[PDB]
Every structure is written in C-alpha cells, then in structure tokens.
Amino acid sequence: TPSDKPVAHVVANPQAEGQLQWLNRRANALLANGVELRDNQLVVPSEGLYLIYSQVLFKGQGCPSTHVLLTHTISRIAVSYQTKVNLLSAIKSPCQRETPAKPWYEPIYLGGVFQLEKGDRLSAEINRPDYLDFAESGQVYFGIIAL
Amino acid sequence: TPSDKPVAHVVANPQAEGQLQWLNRRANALLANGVELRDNQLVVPSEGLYLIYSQVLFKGQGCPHVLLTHTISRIAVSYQTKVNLLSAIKSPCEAKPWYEPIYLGGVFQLEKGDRLSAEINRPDYLDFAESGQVYFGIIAL
Amino acid sequence: KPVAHVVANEGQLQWLNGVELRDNQLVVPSEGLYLIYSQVLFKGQGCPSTHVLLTHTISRIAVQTKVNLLSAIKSPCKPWYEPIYLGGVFQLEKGDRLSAEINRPDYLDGQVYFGIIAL
Numbered sequence: 001t002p003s004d005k006p007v008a009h010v011v012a013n014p015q016a017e018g019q020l021q022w023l024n025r026r027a028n029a030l031l032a033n034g035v036e037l038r039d040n041q042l043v044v045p046s047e048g049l050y051l052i053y054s055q056v057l058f059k060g061q062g063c064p065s066t067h068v069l070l071t072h073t074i075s076r077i078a079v080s081y082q083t084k085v086n087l088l089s090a091i092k093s094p095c096q097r098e099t100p101a102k103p104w105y106e107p108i109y110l111g112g113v114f115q116l117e118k119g120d121r122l123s124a125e126i127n128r129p130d131y132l133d134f135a136e137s138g139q140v141y142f143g144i145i146a147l
Numbered sequence: 148t149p150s151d152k153p154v155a156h157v158v159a160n161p162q163a164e165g166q167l168q169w170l171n172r173r174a175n176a177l178l179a180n181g182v183e184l185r186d187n188q189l190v191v192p193s194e195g196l197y198l199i200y201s202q203v204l205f206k207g208q209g210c211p212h213v214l215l216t217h218t219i220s221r222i223a224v225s226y227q228t229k230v231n232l233l234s235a236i237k238s239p240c241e242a243k244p245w246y247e248p249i250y251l252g253g254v255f256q257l258e259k260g261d262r263l264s265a266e267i268n269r270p271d272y273l274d275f276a277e278s279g280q281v282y283f284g285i286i287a288l
Numbered sequence: 289k290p291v292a293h294v295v296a297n298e299g300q301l302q303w304l305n306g307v308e309l310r311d312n313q314l315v316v317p318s319e320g321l322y323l324i325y326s327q328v329l330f331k332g333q334g335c336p337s338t339h340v341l342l343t344h345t346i347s348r349i350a351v352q353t354k355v356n357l358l359s360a361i362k363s364p365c366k367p368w369y370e371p372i373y374l375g376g377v378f379q380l381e382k383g384d385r386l387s388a389e390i391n392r393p394d395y396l397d398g399q400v401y402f403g404i405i406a407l
C-alpha cells in the first residue's frame with residue numbers, strides 16, 4: 001500500500017544552460033501525493049512539517065578579475081502573504097585571489113524542517129547560473145518530504 | 148507488530164584497503180524485509196517510493212588541488228543502465244587537519260530488482276576514527 | 289506510530305519539546321525499526337588561533353553502554369556557517385535511549401533539531 005505523504009524530488013534541466021530549470025519529468029525525478037511543479041516552483045498540497053532540501057554545484061576554471069559570490073536560497077510564498085520569505089540560504093566564495101588555472105568545484109547544500117500551509121509556493125534559486133555544473137546527473141536537485 | 152517495510156543500513160569496512168566496502172554483519176547495521184547486499188550493492192525487493200541516503204567522511208592532513216567525489220547510483224533491471232541519483236564533487240583545499248563529511252539523500256521511485264551503489268573516488272581519504280561515520284541505507288515509505 | 293521531533297532552546301544543547309524526553313534524551317517506548325535524524329548548525333565570526341573541530345553525534349544508550357549510531361566532524365578553518373546532517377534507520381529495543389550531542393555548544397547557532405519515527 002503506497003504512502004499518502006506529499007513528496008517531491010526535482011532536478012536541474014541539463015540542456016537549459018544559463019538557467020536553473022526544475023524538472024519532474026526526467027529519469028529519477030518525481031511528484032507524489034499532490035505536490036505540483038508550477039512556474040519553476042514546488043506547490044504544497046497540505047499543511048504540516050516538511051523536510052526541505054537542495055543541492056547545487058558550481059564549477060569554474062581558475063579565478064577571474066572580479067570577486068565571485070555564489071548564493072543559493074530557498075524561499076516560501078504563502079497564500080496569505082504573497083511575497084518571497086527566505087527559509088534557507090548560504091553564500092560561498094570559491095576563490096581566495098585572482099589566479100596568479102585549475103578547476104574549482106563549490107557545492108551549496110540547504111536542508112531544514114519547516115511548518116508549511118496548503119498553497120505554499122517554494123522556490124530554490126541561485127545568483128550565478130553561468131557557474132552551474134550539469135556534467136552528470138544527480139548534482140543539482142530540490143525536494144520536500146512531508147513528515 | 149514488526150514493520151514489513153524493506154529497509155537497510157550498511158556500514159563501511161575500516162580495514163578494506165583502497166575500497167569502500169559495505170557490511171551488514173555488524174552492530175547497528177541491518178538488512179530487513181527483503182533487501183539484499185550483493186556485489187557491494189543494495190538490491191530492492193519490490194516497487195515503491197524509497198528514502199535513500201549515504202554519508203562519507205573524508206580527512207586529510209593538510210593541503211598540497213584534491214577533488215573528492217561521492218555518488219549514489221541506480222541500475223534498473225529493465226534498462227540495464229547505471230545512472231546517478233545523487234552526486235557531490237568538492238575541492239577541500241604546519242599542516243592542520245581537515246574534515247569533509249558529505250551526506251547524500253532523497254526520495255525515489257524504485258522498481259523490484261533495482262541495484263543501488265554508493266561510491267567514492269578516494270578511499271584513501273576515508274576516516275574511521277569513530278563508529279557511525281560512513282554508511283549507506285534505504286527505507287521504504 | 290511513535291514519533292518525536294524536538295528542537296534547541298544557552299551554555300548547552302538542550303532539547304525543548306508516546307516518546308518521552310527524559311534527561312535531554314529520547315526514550316524508545318517499543319521495540320522496532322526507527323528512522324532517526326538530526327541536524328545542527330554552527331556559527332562563528334572569523335577564525336580562531338586554536339584549531340577548532342566541530343562534531344555532532346547520535347548515540348544509542350542501550351538497556352547500560354553508549355555507542356555511536358551516526359557521527360561526523362567538520363573543520364571550519366568573515367563570518368561562517370557549517371551545518372552537520374545525520375540520519376538513518378535502526379533496529380531499537382524497548383527502553384533504549386538516544387542522545388544527539390555536540391562537542392562545541394559555544395559555536396551553536398529550522399536547522400537545529402533531533403527526531404525519530406517508528407516505521
């Protein structure tokens with residue numbers, strides 16, 4: 001007998017270079033028990049505690065003239081307050097100095113447990129999609145699990 | 148009454164050289180309700196939504212650049228292909244010692260007979276200081 | 289199904305909440321398979337002179353020895369943030385106790401919790 005818990009695990013679209021496009025229609029991605037993917041956002045079908053999680057992976061070749069700040073932010077748009085409240089975020093600086101040019105890899109991971117309401121819209125956003133790495137699958141993903 | 152959910156929590160072997168070797172014959176390690184451990188892979192006994200998870204802990208004594216990787220993969224019987232579900236790549240860098248835990252998890256639709264691997268590139272960098280540091284599991288929902 | 293999910297409060301890591309919370313420890317009420325999970329978040333401002341290691345550990349106090357179930361270590365060395373995630377499935381006994389602890393409650397900061405679910 002299947003579980004009735006709302007869950008989702010969506011993944012970056014690897015041919016959408018220069019963007020972060022979440023897919024549920026791809027090998028090993030899923031929407032279940034009422035969770036929708038609408039306008040690049042996950043939509044919560046019932047109230048409760050959810051674990052939210054996400055990973056993005058950034059990659060560059062050597063360090064450029066201008067200072068690089070990589071961010072990843074998960075936000076919540078409630079029906080009763082329809083503007084992005086940040087739930088989780090992290091900043092990373094992959095580069096100490098300008099390359100005086102080996103690859104660097106900087107992942108950012110965000111997870112937490114939050115109360116959510118029906119109709120909640122969750123977004124998972126980066127500032128620099130030009131540094132995303134879509135080399136193989138499994139690197140960039142976003143999901144929720146009702147507790 | 149005991150739960151009939153397929154479950155597994157397997158643990159890395161501290162004395163397998165140049166290898167990430169999963170064990171279930173240890174304390175607080177576990178195969179139950181159909182899950183098998185064959186060729187270092189966990190084998191699913193039935194269709195369903197599963198939680199899947201793995202931790203690995205890397206440790207180096209200083210910095211000369213090193214890349215660390217950690218990947219959970221699926222092989223579906225029906226497709227006979229090997230495909231990543233979760234994957235992390237990470238540059239960790241008198242010599243003071245660094246630690247890098249990588250914890251991979253998510254929920255997935257799995258089919259009867261699927262085989263799952265949890266793999267890294269630098270077994271020489273695994274740390275076994277304490278128990279509980281390197282592990283691999285699945286939980287039917 | 290027995291479930292708990294507790295969270296932090298200073299000075300220490302104290303958990304404010306048919307699973308009981310006796311002595312900052314969750315107490316198993318029946319024998320079976322449990323999913324157990326936790327996270328903690330550490331904050332500092334700048335790097336100290338003495339080398340700091342942050343650990344986080346979930347232990348099973350059986351029924352009376354004490355053994356790691358899940359554990360990890362981070363080395364942080366401009367403000368910084370380092371989380372630590374733990375989670376897995378375990379066969380437990382009626383009356384076993386579970387601790388989720390850290391070594392440096394001084395660097396402790398949604399993201400700080402501990403819980404178990406009977407499967």
Ligand SMILES: Cc1ccc(C)c(Cn2c([C@H](O)c3ccncc3)nc3ccc(-c4cnn(C)c4)cc32)c1
Nearest residue numbers: 051053111147198200252253325326327373374375
């Ligand atoms: C993404 C993921 C997949 C599998 C597992 C075992 C975990 C472990 N876990 C953790 C763990 O701190 C973590 C790990 C990775 N991302 C976010 C959090 N917190 C949890 C908080 C809650 C739960 C939880 C409670 N019920 N269910 C069905 C899952 C698990 C939780 C995380």
